[PDB]
Design a protein around this ligand. Structure first.
Ligand SMILES: Nc1ncnc2c1ncn2[C@@H]1O[C@H](COP(=O)(O)OC2CCCC2)[C@@H](O)[C@H]1O
Ligand SMILES: Nc1ncnc2c1ncn2[C@@H]1O[C@H](COP(=O)(O)OC2CCCC2)[C@@H](O)[C@H]1O
Ligand SMILES: Nc1ncnc2c1ncn2[C@@H]1O[C@H](COP(=O)(O)OC2CCCC2)[C@@H](O)[C@H]1O
Ligand SMILES: [Cl-]
Ligand SMILES: [Cl-]
Ligand SMILES: [Cl-]
Lengths: 648, 515, 655
């Protein structure tokens, strides 16, 4: 499905001199043209890819036991396997083997919230801190295969917390520091962890995150948790429960600074990551580790002495893959950025780049757009010439933001890599190789090694041949870092990703292939309602009403309201196998509204819930029609009258 | 009265050429390699060729009868589930692993290695989710449905010790075995079916569990879907539990001498077998005693609740990566032609049954067997008891149509694999005789009164073994003293089978039953 | 810091013919001179020592998985690592691999308390009993990483108890059989063990140790203990608690005689040993195992058919390293000695040596002092010629005891190895290599392979360069068998050993390095004093002072002298039934000197004769002659004591 050659220019930004091995920069791993990418990429998919993947696995990672089979399983039953017979350890490949080679080399550039508090953490320090925690965890009784929940802000010990679980064969489950008590509670209960690692307080952008207060509130509804390990990030007074709670530093003081590595099967679960019932995406060890290491080495052209600056949070897969696992497996310096893009000033990113001579920067378009609105003076006068690659992740990067990234952050001398992937992909799925691909602003370009993607017509289900087609993005074969299951919910795993288009992996995103073969991912434009000052998306309320099994389809719109600013109005149609006769229509309305209140909050409950035979549809739901009906525009295909009656 | 290997066992008529042949001299030449002073090289070669090891072994054998410290390949590590499922699935996932002959013939179907492995991994994941660890006993109470193999191999996959109880034992019999192994998880079925009759397995299980304080989880297979009593919390449905689990599960790396299973003989005597030696013994006996070849379809009509089902339904055949049969019905349901309807239906290449079944079908009449094809068969096996010459010829004349080799296989639960049997491509058979010992088996006749070994031929006495063999039972569960007393004390330096035996003038062994 | 060559003699005892490959004895592993020790020792420290240690690790031990890194970590944070990626099993290296090679070879010479009850235990028997116990422990639920407390006397099954824990990956915590219930309770609670292995009763020297009686008393305050496995050492009636207590023989009768080996990481903890708050010294598996195996092989010059007789107790690190792990790792015969040095007669050691033809003997100077007080008749007429190496461990050895060891046990044909080490060092740290190093009485000589020691001036904090310097002993680099932590108290570990002198390990003992470079722990001690050209032994001059009946004890020391080269200084204490009132103290000083002059000559009179209330002594009875030497030399400001006021009294009489 990929082009054999991408010609021409004038809308193509070719790899700049810094990515051509000129000006003393390293020669790129893949280059110099598109044909060089295809030549290698074809080796990683299709007929002889086993030889390629076996070689990369043995080169990239340190194994205790060699593997015999390269790959097995597939989408149909969710039995994906990569290098199944081999054994290894994530902590060994990210800490031990590098500490053995260069102990004093910096592993983490810890950019603290306050710039003066920033410092470098070496591989020796990170490993010793990781081993102390692992020894603490073993003393609590944590065994191989046990879940450990982590609720940590962007301080450097979070990597030690992750790697400690990976060291002993435990399954860490990171929860974004800043999640509510209810959100943390659901994830803690779902993974059935008995140990929680958290901090007393968080710090970000000069504001304090009351983590331990949130943890205490959440733990009241988490009966399984027995031990809490509390990092003294600020040292301020926080409530501590006797017996349950112990101090991280005090506990580590009793333990040795070395801890042996558990020999893990390639398919032993490495972690659970809940996407924002909670969906705990489960990743294996060897395939995920190889995927992060290879994507970092090629998508960002990382080289042995590089300093990689990913400004994401470890609560998202970006921090998992491209702050901790990817960079540390490659033995390079990685950045843990505790602050915000504009604290203390909108030059924070660029002070960081010149301070540490960062070679790659990896952030989200929301940060890029924020800095553009702050002004050129915060970026125009910096050096930034240590950078070679600038990365965008999380959402489409708009043409204005792409050029600002290129003109000021890169000074027209960096390659811009727009990366598309998901929590379930484990590593970057579609992204330009900076030394080979000429980029188009807003395009993720071409699939990574091991990714064989295609566009499927959502209506017919058939694969769209050729260019200038749009549909839904699918993958044809499993890749090493693919999620292996959803924790204790394999049925939801198969239904969500393997059932909708059989024989394929369903990303769930719209995509386009334009004319040169460049891939374009479509985003989401779900409407936003301002209820009493709170921004509610119509998707959340529609996703909340559908949890009532028996509801087939919903479409919520927003109308004006004299009391709340705006009100949520919801149209609901029940599934045929319901026979709604044991309940009056008003009983279901109260039931559904209470349901949304419990799951989104006391403000997202619909004002009126209209039960209708069917929603108005074309071939999507005509929400513009529904909005006008709620707003008294019936004066301005038969269901429309039915909807008018139920509203009037 | 000597039956030489027939044309189907000579490489004629398109059949595969036998592994050992064509004469007695060919059997002796290889057999001498497997016993005595320099046999370690042969066994080391066979162990490495037959099985997939995660870690190699250094020592071949150690220990002996005196203290029951038998060791084979002790430093090596491997997994029974890997050698029976994974390695074959990686080579040919669509190959039939189990021919599931249901009680109703129309409900029969083929289960691939892909399906058997996926189901095994799901159950293992359920067991791990229950907290089952390596070394834990798990009791299995299952009728002859194909998931019984998945249940067995799931325990072996995670290093648990499965303990099968024949579906049909009373609640007290199930209770005694469940309590003895101290298992906390029981795998059973809602109902079993055999011969048009329903086995109230879950009903029996509930009665037994009232006297089993240790059992915390019961995994209930929905074999029939009829309403059976289920205890909230304790009891869960097999399909619902597996629906939540992934279809792959990693293999626990097991020491060669890690226990593979407990099998209680009908105080309960729990015979314990290790992993590597048992696995190697069953695989070699199946390959040689039945002359199995890669595309063969092996039909052993035993029950998985007996050692015969353990060795020659599940472990032996699946280790060789061939097709094995799980026969849920009886020899005479729906008609006394069921065995022969089955053989032609699936083109079975070997049949393995008991003389009790042979005598049952012979008394039913020739009309049920004479008109079948049966020409896919090459070897007919008898096990469990001496086979009468009347029963032997009826087996040979109608089932084999005088074109199959008859293997009378003698062994015991404690031997793990076949001990004395003719090699079908080399040994000429005598009706009712087990002939000669298998590779690694060094047997002799001892004068029971004097305790001395009877030299020469045409002698009768008791059968003893001189050296341990790889698949020998290693102990009796938590009753090692009973193990030594029953087998190692009566004739010190020997293994005492407990059967009288005679060796004729030609050297053939004739088993005479118990002492 | 080490000498390149040790010259001369006359205070140097060169390796005797039994340690030269003469008289049919094996040629020593290191020899024949000091230069040969340095040539090998230099390979074990410094720049290229990883290659030497990697070779030794692979040659000495059987690994399930090979290691990649040789060493890492260090003193600063207590993250010491040796061969971290490798896997092995102590029970495999101590039992299985030797059993596979020679099953009938004697593993333990079990010398029972009654000599007639002694017998040989083969490797096959020891392994079978180890596997039976390990199987029992697994049935109790003991998992890899679980602590098991052991309270056992010196019966041979103690090795089976230890190695059973190592076989399944449990962490055994040995408690000296004879500790009170309170001492046993604290150790049992501190390691949080749930299984205790003990005996019904112990026997030593005709007296019975009421072990099960003590165990029951302690267990009343041990809520975590669920199972007690009781060895039937005597078969006498002992209280047994239903459920908790089971018989060792009965439990093993139900179990198989083989048990698979748990594949242990190099740095997996092998055992906890609490020193007499309790300090639980924790040792890893591979580094400890290699250290004990190498020290036994080289410090005692062990050979495949040797019979090693270490008379220690397994409740101490000496029993851990040089009864069980070291010798059994080398696959040789080891001795478990259940009796005392004087039961049934003070000739028990020498009856034992001739009975089993022991090739090395390893005991404590405290034991040597007991037998020396019993008389020469118990040793003069024995054979003892199967011995080649005589070892002393536990405390500084005075020259008088050293010569008695050398003259009678060795018949002046054995090398005496004075071994200095600690529970925290795991294996011998400083000791002569018997086939290469010439010995000085009372000196530990030179460091072992991998030990890089130095003397630091405590006042200045700087390391003392050169020879004839004394200060405190420190080690410069980690060694394989170093203890890795104090159980759940790593802060105490760093503070006790790594904080006092950063970058160094602080032994806590003073040491001196003489002009020849020999290390003297706790101080130099005098043997022969050269007064006006005559060689005087401290024994002769002390034997002369004791002829004055009324004198109870004397101890003469030597200092430099500008007129006689060296001067004899004598400390004398009179018998209680003397009533020293008819003579001024100066009158007795002249009288004693004239007596020594009359009996040894006009040159042997001591320069000063100090009358003191009592000589300084330790709780073991050792007269601290090293203290007395320092006091006479004006080092009372720098300087186990049973009476600390005796030292001050001595300082006053000298100053
Ligand atoms: N380059 C991109 N262009 C357009 N959309 C993108 C792009 N990258 C991601 N997305 C959307 O993010 C979802 C995945 O979110 P998540 O699983 O939370 O992972 C987070 C953390 C890392 C990836 C986002 C996709 O399914 C898409 O909807
Ligand atoms: N070919 C044979 N010829 C004569 N007797 C035989 C033969 N096979 C078995 N037996 C008797 O069955 C006992 C073993 O029974 P069991 O432990 O159930 O072993 C199982 C496995 C064999 C089938 C039952 C033997 O010891 C004998 O008594
Ligand atoms: N040869 C020796 N010369 C001088 N002093 C010595 C000597 N051996 C020991 N010590 C002192 O005993 C402590 C160690 O005792 P310990 O840890 O119980 O180990 C015991 C058990 C094995 C080692 C002794 C040292 O630190 C010293 O004070
Ligand atoms: Cl790199
Ligand atoms: Cl085959
Ligand atoms: Cl040796």
């Amino acid at each position: 499905p990929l082009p054999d050659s991408v010609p021409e220019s004038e809308d193509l930004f070719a790899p700049p001199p810094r990515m051509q091995g000129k000006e003393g920069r390293p020669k790129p791993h893949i280059g110099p043209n598109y044909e060089s990418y295809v030549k290698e990429w074809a080796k990683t998919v299709g007929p002889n890819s086993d030889e390629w993947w076996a070689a990369k696995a043995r080169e990239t990672l340190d194994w205790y036991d060699d593997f015999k089979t390269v790959r097995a399983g597939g989408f149909e039953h969710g039995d994906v396997q990569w290098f199944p017979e081999g054994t290894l350890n994530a902590a060994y490949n990210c800490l031990d083997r590098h500490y053995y080679k260069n102990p004093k080399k910096t592993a983490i550039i810890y950019e603290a919230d306050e710039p003066s508090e920033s410092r470098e953490v070496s591989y020796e320090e990170l490993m010793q801190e990781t081993c102390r925690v692992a020894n603490v965890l073993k003393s609590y009784g944590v065994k191989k295969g046990d879940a450990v929940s982590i609720y940590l802000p962007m301080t450097w010990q979070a990597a030690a917390a992750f790697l400690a679980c990976a060291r002993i064969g435990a399954i860490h489950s990171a929860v974004f520091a800043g999640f509510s008590a209810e959100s943390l509670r659901d994830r803690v209960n779902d993974c059935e962890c008995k140990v929680l690692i958290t901090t007393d307080e968080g710090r970000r952008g000069g504001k304090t995150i009351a983590t331990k207060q949130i943890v205490d509130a959440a733990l009241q509804q988490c009966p399984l948790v027995e031990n809490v390990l509390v990092l003294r990030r600020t040292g301020n007074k926080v409530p501590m429960t006797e017996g349950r709670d112990k101090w991280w530093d005090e506990e580590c003081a009793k333990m040795p600074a070395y801890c042996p590595c558990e020999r893990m099967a390639s398919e032993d679960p490495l972690f659970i990551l809940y996407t924002s019932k909670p969906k705990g995406v489960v990743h294996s060890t060897a395939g995920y580790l190889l995927g992060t290491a290879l994507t970092l080495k090629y998508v960002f052209d990382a080289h042995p002495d590089d300093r990689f600056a990913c400004m994401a949070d470890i609560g998202w897969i970006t921090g998992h893959s491209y702050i901790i696992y990817g960079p540390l497996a490659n033995g390079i310096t990685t950045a843990v950025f505790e602050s915000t893009p504009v604290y203390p000033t909108p030059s924070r990113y660029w002070d960081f780049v010149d301070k540490w001579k960062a070679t790659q920067l990896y952030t989200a378009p929301t940060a890029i757009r924020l800095l553009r609105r702050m002004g050129e003076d915060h970026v125009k006068n910096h050096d930034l010439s240590s950078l070679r690659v600038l990365g965008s992740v999380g959402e489409p990067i708009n043409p204005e933001a792409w050029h600002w990234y290129n003109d000021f952050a890169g000074k027209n001398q960096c390659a811009i890599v727009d990366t598309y992937w998901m929590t379930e992909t484990g590593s970057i799925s579609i992204a330009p190789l900076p030394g080979a691909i000429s980029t188009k602003p807003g395009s993720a370009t071409f699939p990574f090694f091991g990714m064989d993607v295609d566009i499927i017509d959502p209506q017919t289900g058939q694969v769209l041949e050729g260019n200038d087609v749009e549909g839904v993005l699918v993958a044809r074969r499993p890749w090493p870092s693919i999620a292996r299951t959803v924790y204790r919910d394999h049925k939801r795993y198969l239904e969500t990703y393997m059932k909708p288009y059989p024989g394929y992996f369903f990303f769930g995103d719209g995509a386009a292939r334009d004319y040169d073969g460049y891939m374009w991912i479509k985003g989401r434009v779900d409407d936003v309602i301002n209820v009493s000052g709170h921004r509610l998306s119509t998707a959340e309320v529609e996703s909340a009403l559908i949890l009532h099994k028996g509801v087939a389809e919903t479409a919520v719109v927003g109308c004006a309201d004299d009391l709340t600013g705006q009100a949520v109005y919801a149209f609901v149609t029940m599934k045929p196998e319901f026979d709604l006769k044991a309940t009056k229509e008003a009983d279901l309305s109260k039931e559904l509204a209470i349901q949304v209140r419990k799951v989104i909050g006391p403000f997202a409950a619909p004002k009126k819930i209209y039960l209708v035979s069917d929603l108005p549809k074309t071939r999507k739901i005509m929400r513009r029609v529904l909005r006008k009906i709620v707003a008294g525009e019936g004066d301005q295909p038969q269901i429309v009258e039915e909807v008018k009656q139920k509203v009037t």
